[PDB]
């Protein structure tokens, strides 16, 4: 584990991360997709071999020795708020199991279901709080990746508030 397990936020492309493994905001089919998924596909295309997995699950595939954890959050266009909330919490619980199993000391993670799977709603707080619920019991350094300047500030405020 990390000597003093921490949360940090970075506003940059998760394909450029400085961590021991990455979480992909994957689709269920293991397709190249859009947004974070497409960036992940460009950087680590070998990790898409048999990466298809259901909503609410995570499946790790190695790119060389570098683990890509494909985490499938729900598309809120299709799920009810209630069922989508359940599957989004479940996806993050499966990420925490994989990060523990891998024995990594750090992980790069995006906010699942916040972009094209958001169903047009701001889900920063919902998705970040499910991330915390799952990752708080892990000892990996967690680095959250985002692109929006206002989101970076809000994620940073949420991390510091708990410390
Ligand atoms: Cl960048
Ligand atoms: Cl998304
Ligand atoms: Cl963002």
């Amino acid at each position: 584990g990390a000597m003093a397990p921490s949360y940090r936020v970075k506003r940059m492309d998760i394909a450029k991360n400085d961590e021991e493994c990455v979480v992909n905001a994957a689709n269920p089919r293991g397709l190249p997709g859009d947004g974070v998924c497409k960036a992940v596909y460009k950087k680590w295309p070998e990790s898409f071999k048999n990466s298809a997995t259901p909503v609410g699950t995570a499946k790790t595939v190695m790119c060389g020795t570098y683990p890509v954890i494909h985490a499938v959050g729900p598309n809120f266009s299709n799920y009810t708020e209630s069922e989508g909330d359940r599957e989004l919490a479940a996806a993050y619980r499966e990420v925490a199991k994989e990060v523990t199993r891998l024995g990594v000391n750090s992980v790069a993670i995006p906010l699942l279901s916040t972009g094209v799977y958001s169903g047009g709603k701001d889900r920063l707080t919902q998705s970040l709080n499910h991330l915390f619920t799952a990752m708080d019991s892990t000892d990996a350094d967690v680095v959250i990746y985002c692109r929006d300047k206002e989101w970076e500030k809000k994620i940073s405020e949420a991390i510091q508030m708990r410390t």
Side-chain angles (χ1 to χ4, degrees), residues 18-127:
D18 195 26
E19 290 75 59
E20 289 177 3
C21 68
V22 68
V23 175
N24 187 25
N27 57 74
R29 311 207 160 257
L31 293 160
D34 304 297
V36 161
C37 194
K38 177 53 65 134
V40 168
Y41 185 69
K42 283 225 197 77
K43 182 60 66 178
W44 305 281
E46 301 86 342
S47 73
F48 290 64
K49 185 55 159 200
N50 294 314
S51 61
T53 199
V55 175
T57 74
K59 183 161 195 201
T60 300
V61 182
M62 306 309 310
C63 175
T65 71
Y66 187 83
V68 177
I69 303 172
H70 298 273
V72 185
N75 177 4
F76 277 100
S77 288
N78 294 335
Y79 284 87
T80 64
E81 292 287 339
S82 176
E83 202 74 6
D85 186 70
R86 189 181 57 72
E87 289 293 6
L88 179 54
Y92 280 119
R93 292 192 300 271
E94 298 301 303
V95 168
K97 295 178 191 171
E98 284 295 283
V99 163
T100 300
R101 184 184 64 75
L102 289 165
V104 296
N105 288 338
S106 65
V107 57
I109 190 158
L111 293 186
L112 298 180
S113 294
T114 58
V116 298
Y117 279 15
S118 72
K121 296 200 180 153
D122 173 346
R123 303 185 184 272
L124 185 171
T125 298
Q126 173 180 28
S127 186

Side-chain angles (χ1 to χ4, degrees), residues 11 111 114 145-149 151-152 155:
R11 185 181 81 103
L111 293 186
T114 58
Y145 288 71
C146 69
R147 297 314 286 277
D148 181 278
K149 283 177 183 204
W151 282 38
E152 182 189 7
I155 295 159

